[PDB]
Design a binder for this molecule. Structure first.
Ligand SMILES: CC(=O)N[C@@H]1[C@@H](O)[C@H](O)[C@@H](CO)O[C@H]1O
Ligand SMILES: *[C@@H]1O[C@H](CO)[C@@H](O)[C@H](O)[C@H]1NC(C)=O
Ligand SMILES: *[C@@H]1O[C@H](CO)[C@@H](O)[C@H](O)[C@H]1NC(C)=O
Ligand SMILES: *[C@@H]1O[C@H](CO)[C@@H](O)[C@H](O)[C@H]1NC(C)=O
Ligand SMILES: *[C@@H]1O[C@H](CO)[C@@H](O)[C@H](O)[C@H]1NC(C)=O
Ligand SMILES: *[C@@H]1O[C@H](CO)[C@@H](O)[C@H](O)[C@H]1NC(C)=O
Ligand SMILES: *[C@@H]1O[C@H](CO)[C@@H](O)[C@H](O)[C@H]1NC(C)=O
Ligand SMILES: *[C@@H]1O[C@H](CO)[C@@H](O)[C@H](O)[C@H]1NC(C)=O
Ligand SMILES: *[C@@H]1O[C@H](CO)[C@@H](O)[C@H](O)[C@H]1NC(C)=O
Lengths: 609, 1030, 104
């Protein structure tokens, strides 16, 4: 049961012994470029650190085994990090994104705690036995804030300080210690921001700070050393090591620094996801980002309706909620060049086209179960038949409308021609039609056809130049498309009649659009905007979000109605067909086949030759 | 009519001035009886003892920038999340007024810096209000000698520690300075800047083109190449050099000045621009130049978009046609930058497209084959008006070059501090965050600090040092001026010139290629620079050995070397002796003591009660800390208690070796001088009396206060006595340091013994200074023939071995020439006649690199015996007799002008210029004059085979003007208050130090009929209304 | 009978024959050359092209063997020499002899 001192310096997490104060060894870790915030766990003797050059937070034991990245997306530059050894949680403060967030110890169930009016949080300290989390801010007005470990009751604890760092709690004396970089001193205070006392002065830049027994340790970048002193008086001043320049964070490694208890206990407080400590040693059950707490106030629920907007190397998700919750990045690996997106509301899998790999890949929302559906070929846009469970995707290299199952089993080609150039495509299985843009030169067309390639007809051909995106909404019975050359967004009924222009101003490069309730969202790559127009016409064009580079596609997802889906005839056993099952207007259900096959005499299976 | 007998008597006058009045015969016996130690060294041991010194000076200096690197390296990995979010400034702060250390400016330096605002300042996230002060103050306190510390961010805020006010008259843009351009992009740029005047470019539109063309040249470095071209019906480059019309010349200080005056000298023409021929010549220049080590090549074009009448896109065809053929012939290495000169709309939107296609080299638009299989370097295009910042737009062309992520320290050559002080040497290294650039850090140090161990080398009397680099540029050599005195030095000087000597180019090979080594060579005595002749230790030699030992300065691109003349002959230095001071030691700082009955001796604080002693900057363990830091009364007492310390209890307060030993060996002059003063009859003729040593000791009587930076080892009387061992050396007339005006000096060397009387065995010289008219008062009293008439047609005169007259009937004149005291201006006919006597007059051309000039001077044969009379000229109208004064370097001569004769020697009365700086003739008479340069700024050699043994060894020695102060000038009288107007005849006023014999009235040439003696303040040079020589 | 010019300064100037004594009481071309060569720096600096022609017309005057008449030259050679060279002569130690004033 020995206490050491862990500190970070460049790419090294170096360890100093406090008894035989001579052992200087480094923690056996590889791949670290720059180490920053430090904290550990008393249960399994893990060491946790933040890497602000790789934008990751990684974890491992004291031997380098089980080296893993628990937080790897959505980080800018976080040097605030602390461990909840009781509730088995992780908190961190990111300065670039201005967010104090939360997740489990393995990196799952990511939730944002503080995202409003937060100006660069840094040093983070935790008091889980009492239910408080303390952190520092610089920026405009440097101050030290207080809040519960769930994001509520945020208060300004110490208003008049300089740029502070190295926030450490002495859990025995009920006091809070911190350094000050502008007034050049180290000072203390009780657990509620007052009774402030300066311990030592004339430190031109005390960056790090920690506490153990009657001794506080700090590092000053001017003196290039780690020092020890009496925690309350400042006497008995000794040097631990010299020639150590620019330590990013120091930490006392001992089991008494992480004692106490709370009501989360060993059963996670019987919460489904997160156990977040609140006053009176109590707890509340937290939920990941965009999840809501149910009525029982112990279980969480995923969002039933939400929107997905993608970038070149990142897929995002935002909800319209009255909490005004922020959007998050979906932890999907190997995202390279996403061109278009679509979502399956049944098995909760997100699909996309990576134009640098020429692949159609799928994965869960949390990143697991990554699978390549299609892998020369050059996909461009996709639209999912969520009923029959099969995908329509257009290939720009062969200029065909090709059909592929969700598992990757090829079905066949339903549309091909010498002059045809199918690009954007959206399906409407509720009525048995598919819509697609036909980008023939100097004669662009918007056509439609049945789900097998026959019954082809041209809907609109005039008034078009570069129809680059397509979408529809079966409830409203409307077809929407954006023109990046004429700079306008238009509308029309699902039969070709009632063609109107919804907006033709302040449009530059609309590469995507979708319908969410009575709102038409679209994305502008050049203007870097997500905006919306009310279809009812009572409200005006409203800005949603700015500062989003490399926009590609957007897709809204409504909750899947259990009764409406199963009452579709092709939903069960694909309607008994071997390939294509399409709804016909006369109320009956008919099987069909691609263009290189013929429907056999049983009117269920297909044949060749 | 005799002349030899008059020379024996006038020579006994010289010995009485040296033996009795100065004490040479006594001090030669005192140093003859002292015991010395001996060394025989080939330079192998001394080279690594001195390489041991400066290598640790560079290691501590590299450990500052490697520190300040890991400072800023950690100052982004932390400040990507711990930024400033604050604002400060570099002015509006009225304390300071300290001028401490090298920072001779207002400087608080209470661990606080400042932030100089650029124009491209926004929000972003960088240096935390320079919270770096935490470490910056530690750096300044823990490493004395360093000067400035600064950080120029990529954003543009210029932050420097410590804080001072340095040109708040505009904006201090550092990203467009030569410091920050050659550091982030250390590769050599081959730039040509093409200017567009003509096609009726307006004057405000031309004013932007000439201001921006002068921001580019003020931002590059000499390892680059530049050639600016003008284009208007014809292409004419700078018409000020030969290789400007052929090659690209490096961008030194001399090329920047010529190329910028060729700017603003061009005014708007009217013919069509003629674009295509302007680019075809810029490639013909880049082609002819060498590649020489990593090179990028760029062309900048400053136009407004010019068309003709029916050749608007046809001449556009011809421009992008030669861009494909010429740049394709160069493997597409050239990059093209274009800047538009728009104002009010004179340049439309279509002429912007013509300057777009030039930067991108968009040749396929105008139908060109473009058979260049290799891609083209895509250039940029920027717009300008009279409101744009020309430092952040045109000055930032270097961001368009490939950044190869070079992370190596770059060492700069000395340059003037842009912050309001003298000379600086700066090393800088870029700063990377993975692949994101941050800016650079830089540590400024005084040039005198880096070189203090090689500029003040006083170990052996047989050796001297010099510092070089890889390609041979001399950073220091005894032929250069001390770094502390300079204003802007010409570093562009190879050692093949300073150490020019036959068979030196063979040793120059092994020094630049081998890390270390040693080597001896044999050189004849004649055809050798003086530094080797002043250190010979065998009498009567025809050739001599020299040993060179060199070694690289580790972890940098510099090389040190030790020169030892005659390594086999033992060199002696004074053994440690401990004589008790018979007369107590008085340090020369009389302003800090004030205890003696003080008085004023010319422009000096002095005393007549006891002589003083001086320690030059070279005597201390740290010469820079003695020159920059003030010297307090406490420092004088530690030095006085240690120099006269007969015991060995007082520790060394900061002196070198052999410093206290040469003070205890020369303390015997205090008894000689005080005894002679009271029994001498020349108390009113001698202005002072002094002795000097090579290790920096200077004893003077009357003991006077001198400037701290005064070095007697660099004066002419000292350098002239060592060249003539044992002989009495007459030096002058020369301007005295103590403000005594023009004086004449008798100097003589004293040796370790007497069995060995060579130049190298000189351990000290003695000197005694007289007045200008004294030696003409001696000729009239000693030699009766001179008084036959009043110095009109029968004139007597004394000449030194350089041609100057220390005694002459006429004194001072149309207030000119400058070299008026030379024989060529006062006696023209003798000069033409003595140039014809063979083996007696030698004209010398030495090369002085200090002020980039070549000096002319005469050297008379000091070993002549017998008379010299008229041989060809002056056979009728002007008889002459010239002979040598025995045992000295002076000559006595008489002229008998019996009939008028007209003779001329060209001597400038406005400058010093020679008439003809093309050739030099032996028989062409002209007073000592100069010629600028005989080199070429193209290859770096001598135009003619001017491998003369040169090195005039500065010998210019920039005369200062250190006065005293008002209010104290009138509170004291003259020391020797020799009341002037109580002297009656000319024989009693000539030679008195603060008097002068007034012969001319206050109006030119009016002989006043009552010549009286007066304080010299009244009548200067004889005219009672004449103005000051100063 | 005239003798040919022997001073190297005044050879190949337009005429070959001169006769001593001249205007400055020089008895031989040897003695006349010793003074005129004191102007040799001015001739090689090329201030006025008329300088060698003007100076040599003074020290080594034209001699015709059986002519012996005083046919005059032309003052224009005197005032072109002093036009371009006098500002440079006064700059250094040179000064015109009074026997060479452009009025004679
Ligand atoms: C990359 C590749 O070959 N993919 C094949 C494709 O060629 C073929 O059309 C399809 C069914 O025939 O199966 C898949
Ligand atoms: C700290 O200072 C107090 C002064 O009141 C002293 O009593 C105590 O022993 C000190 N602690 C240590 C560890 O020296
Ligand atoms: C909701 O939370 C409260 C805590 O204030 C708890 O008492 C209550 O039981 C929860 N709701 C239900 C339905 O249990
Ligand atoms: C359509 O499907 C496969 C993938 O399932 C695709 O690779 C191929 O190019 C197409 N094949 C046919 C027969 O159309
Ligand atoms: C002195 O210089 C002359 C110059 O020609 C040379 O011939 C002679 O050898 C030199 N004397 C030596 C080398 O002893
Ligand atoms: C050069 O040195 C050698 C010994 O190394 C010596 O014998 C010779 O006399 C010297 N030559 C000189 C001094 O000219
Ligand atoms: C010049 O001096 C040298 C040696 O110093 C001597 O040999 C020579 O004879 C001297 N010439 C005359 C003309 O005195
Ligand atoms: C020297 O000058 C004197 C007077 O000026 C004169 O009497 C004497 O004849 C001269 N000597 C000559 C001409 O040899
Ligand atoms: C000039 O001298 C250098 C040696 O410093 C030499 O390399 C170069 O060739 C010379 N230039 C010529 C000979 O044109």
């Amino acid at each position: 049961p020995e206490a050491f001192l862990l500190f970070s310096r460049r790419a090294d997490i170096r360890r100093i012994s406090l008894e035989t104060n001579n052992n200087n060894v480094a923690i056996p870790l590889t791949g670290v470029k720059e180490a920053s915030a430090l904290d550990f766990d008393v249960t399994d003797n893990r060491i946790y650190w933040t890497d602000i050059s790789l934008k990751t937070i990684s974890r491992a034991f004291m031997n380098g085994s089980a080296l893993e990245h628990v937080v790897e997306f959505g980080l800018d530059y976080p040097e605030g990090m602390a461990v909840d050894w009781l509730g088995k949680n992780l908190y961190w403060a990111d300065t670039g994104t201005n967010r104090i967030e939360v997740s489990k110890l393995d990196g799952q169930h990511r939730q944002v705690l503080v995202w409003k009016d937060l100006d660069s949080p840094r040093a983070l300290a935790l008091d889980p036995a009492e239910g408080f989390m303390y952190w520092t801010e610089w920026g405009g007005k440097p101050k030290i804030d207080r809040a519960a470990m769930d994001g509520s009751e945020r208060t300004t604890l110490v208003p008049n300080v300089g740029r502070a760092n190295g926030l450490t709690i002495d859990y025995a004396k009920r006091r809070l210690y911190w350094t000050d970089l502008d007034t050049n001193l180290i000072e203390s205070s009780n657990m509620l921001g007052l009774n402030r006392e300066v311990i030592a002065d004339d430190l031109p830049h005390p960056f790090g700070l920690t506490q153990y027994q009657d001794y506080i340790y700090w590092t000053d970048w001017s003196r290039r050393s780690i020092e020890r002193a009496n925690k309350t008086s400042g006497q008995n001043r000794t040097i631990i090591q010299g020639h150590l320049d620019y330590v990013m964070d120091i930490l006392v490694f001992h089991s008494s620094r992480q004692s106490g208890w709370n009501e989360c206990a060993s059963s996670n407080g019987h919460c489904s996801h997160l156990c977040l400590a609140v006053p009176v040693g109590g707890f509340v059950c937290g939920c990941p980002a965009h999840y809501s707490l149910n009525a029982d106030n112990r279980t969480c629920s995923a969002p039933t309706t939400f929107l997905l907007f993608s970038q070149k190397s990142a897929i995002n998700r935002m909800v319209i909620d009255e909490q005004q919750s922020p959007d998050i990045i979906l932890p999907i690996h190997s995202l390279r060049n996403v061109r278009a997106i679509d979502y399956d509301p049944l098995d909760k899998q997100l699909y996309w086209i990576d134009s640098r790999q020429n692949m159609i890949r799928k994965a869960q929302e949390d990143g697991s179960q990554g699978f390549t559906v299609v892998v020369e070929i050059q996909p461009y846009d996709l639209s999912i038949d969520i009923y029959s469970r099969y995908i329509y995707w257009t290939c720009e290299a062969t200029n065909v409308i090709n059909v592929t199952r969700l598992d990757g089993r090829s079905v066949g080609v339903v549309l091909k021609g010498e002059q045809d150039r199918p690009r954007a495509v959206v399906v409407n299985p509720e009525k048995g039609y598919m819509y697609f843009t036909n980008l023939q030169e100097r004669s662009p067309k918007i056509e439609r056809a049945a789900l097998d390639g026959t019954e082809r007809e041209v809907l609109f051909f005039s008034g078009l130049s570069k129809p680059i995106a397509l979408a529809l909404d079966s409830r409203l019975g409307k077809l929407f498309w954006a023109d990046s050359d004429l700079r306008r967004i238009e509308s029309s009924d699902l039969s070709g009649a009632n063609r109107i222009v919804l907006e033709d101003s302040n449009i530059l490069q609309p590469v995507g659009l979708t319908v969410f309730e009575n709102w038409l969202y679209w994305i502008d790559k050049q203007q870097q905007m997500i905006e919306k127009i009310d279809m009812t016409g009572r409200e005006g064009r409203t800005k949603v979000q700015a500062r989003i580079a490399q926009l590609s596609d957007i897709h809204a997802v409504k909750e899947l109605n259990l009764q409406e889906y199963r009452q579709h005839p092709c939903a069960q056993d694909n309607g008994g067909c071997s390939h294509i099952c399409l709804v016909k207007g006369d109320g009956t259900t008919r099987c069909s086949c691609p263009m290189h096959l013929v429907l056999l005499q049983d009117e269920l299976s297909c044949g060749g030759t | 009519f005799s002349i030899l007998d008059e020379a024996q008597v006038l020579a006994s006058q010289m010995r009485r001035l040296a033996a009795e009045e100065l004490g040479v015969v006594t001090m030669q016996r005192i140093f003859n009886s002292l015991v010395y130690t001996e060394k025989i060294s080939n330079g192998e041991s001394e080279v690594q003892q001195l390489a041991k010194k400066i290598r640790e000076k560079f290691n501590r200096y590299l450990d500052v920038v490697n520190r300040n690197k890991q400072v800023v390296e950690a100052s982004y990995t932390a400040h990507l999340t711990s930024p400033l979010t604050a604002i400060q400034d570099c002015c509006t702060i009225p304390p300071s007024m300290m001028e401490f250390d090298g920072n001779f400016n207002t400087n608080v330096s209470r661990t606080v810096s400042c932030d100089r605002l650029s124009t491209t300042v926004n929000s972003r996230a960088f240096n935390p209000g320079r919270d770096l002060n935490s470490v910056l103050a530690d750096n300044l306190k823990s490493n004395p000698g360093i000067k400035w510390q600064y950080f120029s961010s990529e954003e543009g805020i210029f932050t420097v520690f410590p804080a001072h006010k340095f040109r708040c008259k505009g904006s201090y843009e550092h990203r467009s300075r030569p410091i920050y351009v050659s550091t982030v992009r250390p590769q050599s740029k081959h730039i040509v800047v093409i200017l567009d005047h003509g096609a009726s470019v307006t004057d405000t539109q031309l004013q932007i083109a000439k201001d921006a063309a002068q921001v580019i040249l003020s931002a590059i470095d000499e390892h680059d190449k530049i050639s600016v071209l003008t284009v208007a019906d014809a292409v004419r480059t700078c018409s000020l050099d030969q290789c400007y019309k052929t090659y690209l010349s490096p961008a030194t200080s001399e090329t920047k000045r010529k190329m910028s005056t060729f700017v603003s000298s061009v005014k708007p023409s009217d013919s069509p621009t003629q674009h295509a021929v302007g680019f075809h010549r810029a490639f013909q220049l880049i082609r002819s130049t060498s590649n020489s080590a990593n090179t990028d090549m760029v062309i900048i074009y400053l136009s407004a978009g010019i068309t003709s009448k029916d050749s608007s896109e046809e001449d556009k065809k011809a421009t992008l046609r030669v861009i494909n053929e010429e740049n394709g012939f160069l493997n597409n290495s050239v990059m093209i930058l274009t800047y538009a000169l728009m104002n009010d709309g004179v340049t439309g939107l279509k002429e912007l497209a013509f300057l777009r296609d030039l930067a991108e080299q968009n040749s396929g638009k105008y139908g060109i084959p473009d058979r260049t299989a290799l891609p083209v370097i895509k250039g940029s295009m920027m717009v300008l008006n009279q409101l744009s910042n020309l430092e952040t737009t045109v000055g930032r062309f270097y961001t368009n070059l490939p950044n190869r992520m070079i992370d190596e320290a770059v060492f700069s050559l000395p340059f003037s501090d842009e912050m309001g002080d003298g000379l600086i040497m700066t090393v800088s290294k870029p700063c990377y965050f993975g692949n994101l650039l941050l800016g650079i850090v830089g540590v400024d140090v005084n040039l005198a600090y880096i070189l203090e161990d090689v500029t003040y080398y006083q170990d052996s009397l047989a050796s001297y040092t010099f510092l070089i680099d890889d390609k041979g540029y001399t950073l220091m050599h005894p032929s250069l001026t001390r770094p502390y005195l300079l204003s802007e030095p010409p570093l562009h000087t190879d050692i093949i010139h300073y150490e020019n000597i036959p068979k030196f180019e063979l040793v120059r090979q092994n020094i630049l290629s081998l890390p270390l080594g040693s080597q001896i060579i044999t050189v004849p005595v004649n055809s050798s620079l003086s530094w080797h002749i002043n250190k010979l230790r065998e009498t009567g030699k025809e050739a001599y050995n020299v040993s060179y030992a060199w070694k690289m300065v580790q972890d940098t691109s510099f090389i040190l070397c030790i020169v030892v003349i005659q390594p086999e002959i033992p060199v002696k230095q004074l053994k440690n002796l401990n004589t008790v001071p018979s007369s107590k030691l008085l340090y020369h700082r009389l302003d800090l003591l004030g205890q003696p009955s003080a008085c004023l001796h010319f422009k000096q604080l002095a005393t007549l009660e006891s002589p003083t002693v001086m320690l030059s900057a070279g005597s201390f363990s740290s010469p820079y800390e003695h020159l920059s830091q003030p010297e307090t009364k406490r420092m004088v007492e530690h030095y006085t208690a240690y120099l006269s310390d007969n015991t060995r209890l007082i520790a060394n307060p900061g002196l070198k070796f052999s410093v206290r030993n040469e003070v205890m060996a020369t303390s015997h002059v205090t008894d000689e001088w005080m005894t002679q003063m009271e029994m001498s009859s020349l108390n009113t003729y001698i202005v002072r009396r002094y002795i000097a040593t090579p290790n920096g000791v200077l004893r003077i009587y009357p003991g006077s206060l001198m400037d701290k930076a005064f070095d007697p080892t660099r004066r002419q009387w000292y350098l002239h006595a060592v060249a003539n061992p044992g002989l009495i050396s007459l030096t002058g007339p020369y301007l005295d340091v103590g403000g005594a005006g023009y004086v004449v000096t008798i100097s003589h060397t004293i040796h370790s013994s007497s069995t060995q009387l060579s130049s190298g065995h000189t351990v000290a010289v003695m000197g005694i200074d007289f007045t200008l008219r004294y030696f003409y008062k001696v000729l009239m009293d000693l030699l009766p023939v001179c008084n036959q008439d009043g110095g009109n047609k029968i004139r007597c005169f004394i000449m030194e071995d350089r041609g100057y007259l220390v005694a002459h009937p006429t004194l001072v004149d149309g207030h000119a020439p400058l070299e008026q005291q030379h024989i060529t201006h006062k006696e023209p006919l003798v000069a033409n006649d003595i140039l014809n006597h063979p083996n007696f007059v030698k004209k010398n051309l030495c090369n002085s690199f200090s002020d980039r000039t070549v000096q002319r001077s005469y050297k008379f044969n000091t070993s002549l015996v017998g008379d010299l009379t008229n041989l060809v000229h002056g056979s009728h109208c002007s008889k002459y007799r010239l002979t040598r004064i025995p045992g000295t370097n002076a000559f006595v001569g008489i002229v008998n002008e019996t009939c008028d004769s007209l003779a001329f020697c060209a001597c400038s009365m406005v400058d010093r210029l020679c008439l003809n700086c093309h050739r030099m003739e032996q028989n062409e008479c002209e007073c000592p004059c100069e010629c600028p340069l005989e080199v070429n700024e193209c290859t770096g050699n001598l135009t003619n085979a001017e491998n003369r043994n040169p090195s005039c060894e500065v010998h210019q020695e920039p005369v200062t003007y250190t006065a005293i102060d008002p209010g104290l000038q009138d509170a004291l009288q003259q020391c020797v208050n020799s009341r002037c107007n109580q002297r009656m005849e000319s024989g009693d006023c000539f030679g008195v130090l603060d008097c002068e014999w007034c012969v001319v009235d206050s109006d030119g040439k009016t002989h006043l009929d009552k010549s009286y003696c007066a304080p010299q303040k009244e009548c200067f040079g004889g005219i009672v209304g004449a103005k000051s020589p100063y | 009978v005239c003798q040919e010019i022997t001073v190297p300064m005044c050879r190949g100037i337009g005429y070959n024959l001169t006769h001593m004594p001249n205007q400055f009481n020089h008895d031989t071309q040897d003695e006349a050359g010793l003074e005129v060569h004191q102007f040799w720096p001015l001739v090689e600096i090329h201030c006025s092209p008329d300088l060698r022609f003007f100076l040599c017309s003074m020290y080594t005057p034209i001699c015709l063997p059986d002519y012996h008449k005083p046919l005059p030259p032309c003052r224009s050679v005197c005032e072109r020499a002093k036009a371009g060279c006098s500002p440079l002569m006064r700059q250094y130690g040179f000064a015109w002899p009074e026997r060479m004033s452009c009025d004679r």
